[PDB]
Every structure is written in C-alpha cells, then in structure tokens.
Design a protein around this nucleic acid. Sequence first.
RNA 1: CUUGAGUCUCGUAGAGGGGGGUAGAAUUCCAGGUGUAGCGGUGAAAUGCGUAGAGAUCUGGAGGAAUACCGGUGGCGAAGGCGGCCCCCUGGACGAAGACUGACGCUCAGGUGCGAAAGCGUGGGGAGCAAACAGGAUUAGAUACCCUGGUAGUCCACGCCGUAAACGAUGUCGACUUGGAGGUUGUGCCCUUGAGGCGUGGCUUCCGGAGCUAACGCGUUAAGUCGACCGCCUGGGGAGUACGGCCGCAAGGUUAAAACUCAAAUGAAUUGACGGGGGCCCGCACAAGCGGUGGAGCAUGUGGUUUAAUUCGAUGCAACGCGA
Lengths: 117, 150, 51
Amino acid sequence: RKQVSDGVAHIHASFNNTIVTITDRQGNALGWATAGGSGFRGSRKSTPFAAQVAAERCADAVKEYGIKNLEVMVKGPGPGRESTIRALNAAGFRITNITDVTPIPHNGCRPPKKRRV
Amino acid sequence: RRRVIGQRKILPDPKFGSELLAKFVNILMVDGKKSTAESIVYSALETLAQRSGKSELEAFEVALENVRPTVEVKSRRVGGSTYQVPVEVRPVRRNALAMRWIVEAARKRGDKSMALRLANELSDAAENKGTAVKKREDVHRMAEANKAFA
Amino acid sequence: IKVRENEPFDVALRRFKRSCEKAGVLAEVRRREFYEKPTTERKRAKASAVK
RNA sequence: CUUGAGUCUCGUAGAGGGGGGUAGAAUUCCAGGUGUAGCGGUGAAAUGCGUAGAGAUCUGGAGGAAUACCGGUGGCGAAGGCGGCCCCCUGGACGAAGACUGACGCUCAGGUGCGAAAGCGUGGGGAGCAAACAGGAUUAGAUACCCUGGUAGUCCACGCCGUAAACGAUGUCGACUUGGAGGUUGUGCCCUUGAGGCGUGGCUUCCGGAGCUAACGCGUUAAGUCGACCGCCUGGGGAGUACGGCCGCAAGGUUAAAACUCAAAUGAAUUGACGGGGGCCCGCACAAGCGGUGGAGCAUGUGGUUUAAUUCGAUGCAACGCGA
Ligand SMILES: [Mg+2]
Ligand SMILES: [Mg+2]
Ligand SMILES: [Mg+2]
Ligand SMILES: [Mg+2]
Ligand SMILES: [Mg+2]
Ligand SMILES: [Mg+2]
Ligand SMILES: [Mg+2]
Ligand SMILES: [Mg+2]
Ligand SMILES: [Mg+2]
C-alpha cells in the first residue's frame, strides 16, 4: 500500500537455482520470486523457461503497489539472465535500464579447487 | 535406418471410402480377420443412429477431437543421463495415434461386446470419458507441462 | 555494462556488453584456479591458432 | 699491435632485485533497514543454514589475500623465478658515433654463494583456499573421487632445510656452414610526404636443406663441421638401499656398496588387437508399432537329484523340439 511507482529488480542468476526480487528504488524488498518455490524443485528448475514462471510470480506479490516502471539487475551467470527480463517485459512492467552486476573480481580471493571426477 | 520413401497408401473404407477411416479399421483389425473388424466397427459406427438420430458421419471426427493430442515426450540419451525433451505431433500420427487410444482402450471397457463396447466409447470420446480421453491429459501433463526441457 | 533506451521495447543491446566480460571470465573462475595448468594450456592452445 | 676482453660517453626496453607507500574490483565477517519460507548443494540426494527470520536486497564498518582488462606464439633473470599504480636504493642486457686500456682471456676439481613447493624454529597474522579430522552420499565395500564443514599450512619477519619431470630430460666459451615466414627491442638511411620503404645489431618463435641420427627427429638459438675446459655413463633387480663419514633442530640430505638373483632390463619405430578415444558409416541393433516368452496346464530337451542303469555326445552368442 506504499505505491513505489518504480523500483529496480535484482536477478540473482545462479546455476543450481535463480531468484528475482522486485526491490524498490533505495533497495528495499517489495517482492521476491524463486524457482525452488515455483512448484518444480529438485533440479528441474535452473532452465530459463523455469525461472520465467518464477520471477513472474512477483507480479502476484509485488502487484499490491503499482510498479509502472522498473530497471533490471542481472547478477551471476546461469539459465535466468535472459528469461527473467523477458517474462518481466510481458508481465506488463516497463523498463529503464538493463545491467549486469555479476561479481567480477581482479584475481582477489582464490576460488575452490573442487570438482575432479 | 537411413531408408527414406513414402507412406503406404491404404484402401478406403468398404463404403464411405476414406483413408482416414481405412487405417482406422486396420488399427482395429485383428488376426488379419479384417472382415470382423468391418462388421464390428462399421456397425457401431452407424449404431450411433439409436444413440442420436441423423447423418452420423462427422460424429467420428468430432469424437476424435477430444482424443487428438498435440504434444508428446521423447527421452534422449544425452547429458550423461536421459532427457525427455517433449515435442508436438504432426497430423500424420495425430489422427492415427488417437485411433489407437480409442480402440486399445475400448477393449478393456468390459461391456456387452466389442461391437458395442466400442460404440459407447465414441460417444464418451466427444463427451470426454474412458482412458481414451484420459490418455490425452495424462500425456499432456508431460509435454507442455514440463517445457523446462522442451 | 549500462543499458538505457527511449521508446519501450525489449530489443536487446544487452549482448553488446556480452563481449568483454559476461559468462566467460565468470566460468573462468567458477571452479579452481590454474597455476601451471594455464601457462601451459595457454601456450599450447596458442599453437592451435596457426592454421 | 688490436680484432678478444674491459673502461668511458649518450641513449633504449624490461613482471630483474630489496625497501616503503597507495588504489580499485571481489570474498568473508559485524551491525542496522526492507522483506518472507526458503536457501545451499548434487547425477540425484543428504549433512548444513532458515520462522531465534535465512537466502535475496540495501547502508555503514572491520580485515586479509591476490592484482581482471592490457597479456602476447611478449619481456627480464644464471638458475629458481618475476605481473596493479607511485617513490627510494640497486644489477644486468643492448645499440651508436665514437674516445681509452692493451690478451688484462676461456674453462674450472675442491671452495663460496644463490635454491619452486612442501616442511622446521621463534614471534606475528589469518579473508579465501585447504593435508588432518568430522559429518552426508556413492559402493559389494569406499579409511577415496562428490557434497557440508575444517586445523596445520598457504601470508609477514628473521633463521633453517637444500630437494623437483630444478626439463630444452640437450654444460660453459669461441669460429665456421643453403633458405623461408613471423615476434620483440636499438640504430642508419628514404619526396621521412604514409600505415609507411630500404638496410644494419641484440634477444626470440615456427617451417625446413646439406649433414647428423637407431628412429623420432635436430637443423646457423644444431642433436651439422671443428677447437678449450669441466661434470657424467658402463646390463636389469637388489638400490640411490645398507654401513661409515659429513651436514641437519627434525624431517631427512650428501657421498655410496655387497650378498644374492635374472637373461634380460631398455630406446625408437612397424603390423595388428583393444580403449568406459575421436571422425564417418551399415544391420529389426535401437527408436515406431504387431504379436509373444517370463505366470498357467500339457509337450520337449537340459542341469540337477536319483537310479543296478538312468548309454555316449552337444554347454556364451555357435548348447537345450540338438546328433535322433
Ligand atoms: Mg573438501
Ligand atoms: Mg634469457
Ligand atoms: Mg615456503
Ligand atoms: Mg611457519
Ligand atoms: Mg626444424
Ligand atoms: Mg613407444
Ligand atoms: Mg530386414
Ligand atoms: Mg523394440
Ligand atoms: Mg508389448
């Protein structure tokens, strides 16, 4: 019941899952979505056409205000960097600026050895 | 394997003369006793009169409408495991496939006799009933219902 | 990476920044590092680029 | 005496070294705001974290490690190795007009010094990562690979240890010997009118001729043709082990056998077989369907079991309604 009018939307695009939260201008949570919470779980998610149905779920929780326009914050790789923005363009929302906020360091921390099969 | 020719031109119904109904009787046929097939379906096909009362002709196609799918699965030996990538179904098999469900499920109906056990199914087809109509959604719940892979 | 356009439309322009960073220098990190594995495979893949 | 070697001058490029600063991205953590039932992870899962409010998101703060892009088939160094920007102290390499010294050189057992990483001692530091260790999973088992955590350690100082597939598996120095394309850096010259064009030095890639080579291949940066000095090898196993010496805080290092045992151990290349290697193919091989077998009663054969005998044979696809 605040009517933020316009607020950026963060798209935490990951591999094992993807989640988009339609925060406000300053950066306050107004409504978040989630593939894991979008019916199918396990790992069936991930896929782009699976995240789209997730972020689209926001237009059902963050619609209580009246977002007439909004930007997009895509972070991290994975099947949900495009899908999300698309579903949002159809949901009825607008757009003000697309950008990738993926954490790309300068050889700072030393990543995990991991995987070796 | 690599062979690429054409389809087997089937002989039309023993009366209405229609390939659509032709392969229909064949799919229904058994033990090469094609005769019985005709005398078993050609009857129930017209017995619709008692079930309606008019030029029972399009009823067949209309009944198949409620049994015409447009999406199926297809496991693929990829990504180490086995995919499922569902895909639609061309017309060539749409009409065909349906006919199977209409018959291959009209036999387990357990009614008076195959001759009639089949007739009723047609009425249940357009009116949604029996596994015949079931198989549709029970199949659609995969394709278009799991596009995550499609 | 900074998009912005007048006349609402979901054209793209997005894959334009997708040529300098993006999912590349990302997966580059993802798993472990490299150390000797790179200085080597980086100097062998170079051989490839000849013909 | 001057061409070897060296000095002087003036330039050039460089992640060469030692010290001290400093910047930006990211991670983690602490605090607070928004917001709400998931997050994280895998092939799946589970451990784990979440309603004591996570994850996400945003604001502020603390701290440590490493410096995307440039980055290259690149550069510097004796080797090991050396990447952000800035300053201070410092080494070597190269070019050019030249000027100077005058064989002052090459190599070098012993000797001295430098040495990746791991490790060791004292004291600091500690974000991420991660031997050990602990859970979860996989599996016949799984003291592993995978997942959730995580200590030493990785970082700093100072001292020690001296090893590596410390590799070009190719000692240093010098002179000769067809060529082609390229990289990087200096210099001379050319309507320098230009990106530019022609030479002449340094270092360096790839192809390759003669020749060399057991072959692979090396080929002016030689494994070609020669000269000077040094290190080293003499069948495989036993064994870089034992013993002794020396070194070390300790790991352990260095030097280095015998007994006995085998008739080989080995190098490259060839033919093929195979690969849970790659490319391209065909077969009812699969996929698409039609009907079966597997259950049932009976037939038939076989292995069993039995029998005085249950005659002999046939036994993965190629054995069993087979010799019959
Ligand atoms: Mg681990
Ligand atoms: Mg050098
Ligand atoms: Mg060390
Ligand atoms: Mg220590
Ligand atoms: Mg050559
Ligand atoms: Mg060999
Ligand atoms: Mg055939
Ligand atoms: Mg089959
Ligand atoms: Mg079957």
